[PDB]
Each structure stands twice: as structure tokens, then as C-alpha cells.
Amino acid sequence: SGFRKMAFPSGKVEGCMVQVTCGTTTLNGLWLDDVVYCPRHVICTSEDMFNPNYEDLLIRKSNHNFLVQAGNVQLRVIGHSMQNCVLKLKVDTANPKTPKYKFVRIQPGQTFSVLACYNGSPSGVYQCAMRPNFTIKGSFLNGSCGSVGFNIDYDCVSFCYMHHMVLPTGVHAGTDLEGNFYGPFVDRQTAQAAGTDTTITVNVLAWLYAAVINGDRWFLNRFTTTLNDFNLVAMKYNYEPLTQDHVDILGPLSAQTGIAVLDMCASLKELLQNGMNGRTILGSALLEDEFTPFDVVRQCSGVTFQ
């Protein structure tokens, strides 16, 4: 009963957040085993930010220059290295709260939870999607860098995002946990803009299945369509092309509801061409594209985590 934007429980990630200070710059780090991962611009002064030479700035730091705090406890740094846009600080204490974890690089259209943090302390949790233009629509303030995005699978935390910056129009950009940016962005205070975004078609379809499961069925029409003819219509509305891989991922929801994917595609086609006529779907007056097929299955089936 009901359908909500739902984040993963954040406790396993909360137990990994620390504060990292270098000079007067402070941000968040992620403490897993005996390594703290954080954005490399912790080593920048305000003026370094416009054209930083991170390798040069790091040459002039030693271990003791990094103040790492886990709650009230300072963690002694005993080694450091740079990997793309992330700093790795080896500390002399392994985090006893380290969960089973993976570093993953997610694909555009996939979702994750963000644990927004300031000064190593958690503020809140929310769900995001990696947009097709490789930005995310987050909520971040000064000092939020190093906050991470993640998914959970049973007991395993898959970390997929570390926060680095905000772009014009207010969308956000960051890296995977190997320090490689999503998209064509750099960690430098320089003129940068997101490309034009697109609507994540497979997710809109997932959310229409969630509507059917939850009893909101008014938009279901009596037609079908071919994949080619659907994509011709969707392209005009700045929807991303629907692939056979997308069709296959929708299979569980199609099987559960008894509505063929291409039938749902015909109903979406009508919504795009005619609008929703003042009506809502699952309480929204716009079509929602930040629920994946798995998000819908997980919420409508009550999948839990260890």
C-alpha cells in the first residue's frame, strides 16, 4: 500500500563517515578498513581552487597535515596517495564498523541513496538518479563534499558516488570511489555546464507499473505499439531510446501485472501525446523517471537488508 521515494537504510554508511581537515579546509571522508577516501580538493586553499595543481599541492603535504576525526577520536594518518580525484589516507586504525562493501561505477538511469554529511556528521538521506547527462539532482550545501551515494544488497554496500561540486542550474557532479568523474567535469572552479538532459524512459515505464500495482490504472489504454514506433514518438519528447535490454529488465514487472511492456509503451505514448489532463499518477502531476525497475520491485515486495 502506497508508493514513496525511498532511500536505503543509512546506518552501515553512517558508521563510515569521518571529518577530514587539511589546513583550514574541511570536508567529509569515508573510512573503510584502514583507509579514508575523500575528495582531493581538501588540500586546496580558496585561491588554489581556480586552477589547482593537485600533484604539486600534495607534494608539500605530509601525513601529519591531515586531521582525520571519527567522532571525538583523531585517527593518525600513516600514509597517503592520490587516485584520480580522490585522496586515500591510510590510518593506523581499521574501522571496526566497516560493512561488506564494493566500489561500483553506475550507469546513467540507475538510482542510489545519498547520505548528505557536514563535518563528518550525517544530515539526511535521499534518493537520486544518475542523469543521462551524468549529473545528479541532489541537495548539497557548502562542506557537503565527500558525502557518498550507495546501494545496498543484503549486507553489501555498493558505493557508487562521492560528491565534488555543483554546476550552473544547480545540478551536482562527482566521482566514483576510484576518483573518476561521472561526465566531462573536472574538480576546478572553472566555467562548466551540464549537457542537455533526457528523460529516462525505462524508469518512467517502471513507475507506470508501480502505479498499476498500487491501483492507479486510469491511463491504461487498449492499444499496443512496436518498439520502433514508440521510440519515434519518445524521441520528440526528449525521452531516451528504449532498448531491448530495457524491455528485458522490465520483465518481472510485466509478468507481475500481466501487462506486456509494449502495451505499457502504448499507454505512455498516449500520455506523451495528450498529457495527463489535470490528473495525477501516484500523486504526481508529472511523469516520474527516478525509480528503476528494481526500485519498484524492492518497494512493492518489501526487500530487506542485513
Add this chain to the structure above:
Amino acid sequence: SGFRKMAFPSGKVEGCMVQVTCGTTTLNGLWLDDVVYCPRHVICTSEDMFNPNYEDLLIRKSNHNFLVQAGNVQLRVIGHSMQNCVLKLKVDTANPKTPKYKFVRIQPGQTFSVLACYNGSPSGVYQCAMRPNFTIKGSFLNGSCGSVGFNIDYDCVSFCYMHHMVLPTGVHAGTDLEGNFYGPFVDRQTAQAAGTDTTITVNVLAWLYAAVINGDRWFLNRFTTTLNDFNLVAMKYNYEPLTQDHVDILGPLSAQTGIAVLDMCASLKELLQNGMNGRTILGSALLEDEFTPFDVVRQCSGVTFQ
């Protein structure tokens, strides 16, 4: 930058969730110090549900009849009692992860985070409001009872909701942690319906301030209004009356933005009378009423928790 529906970090509550089984009925419980709190209908069979005599059903239970599991560890029950609609099971082990906490009864219009759980294991977290008709718009499945709602203030978890049932139209009903229902509902499988709901005016105003803070300002008009004349208009649109207490609670946001509350009221008046004309505010095509003034301040100022 950005504005999202944001839940509190759930870790402090995750460390309190357990599974409670009596006979063949299983639901979630909340383990604080040496007491487990859970919905009393854990003691009901399926047929007991329609007209249960909870006092009679509990007479025929003893401590050993309650199987309480915290992960892989069974907790021995050494005492039990009923308080309104909640069962309290004394166990022989105090929860070492008990946070500082309070039991509070919230008022209609206030928000909280829900940690949805199944079989004592967390599934996800989302933000809800206590509706003026004393229901909540949650997302719950079979076995979700005993999931709790809460707010956090620094290090203190204020528990305010325990989940018990779903009503027609799919809205949800439950109790405070003293077992007293919000609203005129009973924990019995009998014909019950929520009263007509109303829109939480002070929260819509809070969210318009959040829009201004985040740069979405198109709806700001050049007028003001009196409190009386605003409430005459709002009443027609099923908005709850705006009180002086509400005006006072909006004061921090008014001071931050330099927009007097009654000026924002004039802009809301225009939105109600004319609509949004295809435009969005903070990405939504409807006016949002499940952010409190404090929710907005907490998100736009980066308040963290210990």
C-alpha cells in the same frame, strides 16, 4: 543547492529493530534498554483480527510464548504487559545500541521519518507527515507493523509513530509509542475510514520559502494580504486556517528571505485562485505540503546529527 524530500539518517533506529513472533504471527519490535515495544496484535491469529479481545488473548500467553530475535540472537522474554495498543516485552538483555531517546506525540502537520521494516530487518526510509485527518501517506506491506516513525535532534531520537494498519484509499494509521492511536481508529479488522483531509497551509508556505531560497521565485507577486482575508480564500480550497502560531513559526524563514509571511500569503492566494499555469515550483507541478518550517531550515542550513 537543490531541495529534496529528505529523511533523517536511520542508523540509530536500525540498531533498535527486532523481530517478534507469537504463534505464527510475526512483526517488528523496537528494542530500547531492556524492553521491546510492538503492536499488540502480534498475539492475534488471523481470525482473532475481526473482533479481538486483547486482554483475553494476552491472559493465555506467558513470557516464553514470545520469540524475540535481534539478528541471529534470541532475546529471552522475562516479563510482559499491555499499554493501550502496544505490547511491552521485558527482556533479560539491555540493548547496547540504545540511543538517547524520547517518546513524543506529534501534532497534525508535523513530519517524521519512517524506517520501514520486515521481519525485524530494515527495508528503506522515507519522510511522512501526520495528516490533518490523523492518517499518514506511507508505503507499507504485509509484515510492516511495528515499523516506527521518528525525528532526531542532535543525538536524541524522538519516536512518534508505530505502524498498525492501512485504511481504504491506502492511507495508514498507527499509534504513538504509548500505544494511543492517532485519530479515531482501532486495531480491529472492521469498517473504518479516514475523514476528509485538508492541506497543511503553514507547510505550503514553508515550501514556497524553500523555493525562494533555492532561486525559484516566479510566483512572488507585488501584493500583501491580511490574515483574515487569506484564510477566507484558503478555506475554499480546503486549506487549513493559518494561525498566528503558524505565522510565528515561519519567522526564521521570513527573516532569512526578507519576505513577510503575509506577503507570501498573498502570493499563495494568487496560486490558489489562478493555478500554476503549466509551471513548476522546485520541480513539482502541485503545491507541496509535507515540509515543515523546520524541515526547510534543516535542509537549507545543513543541520547534522550525533
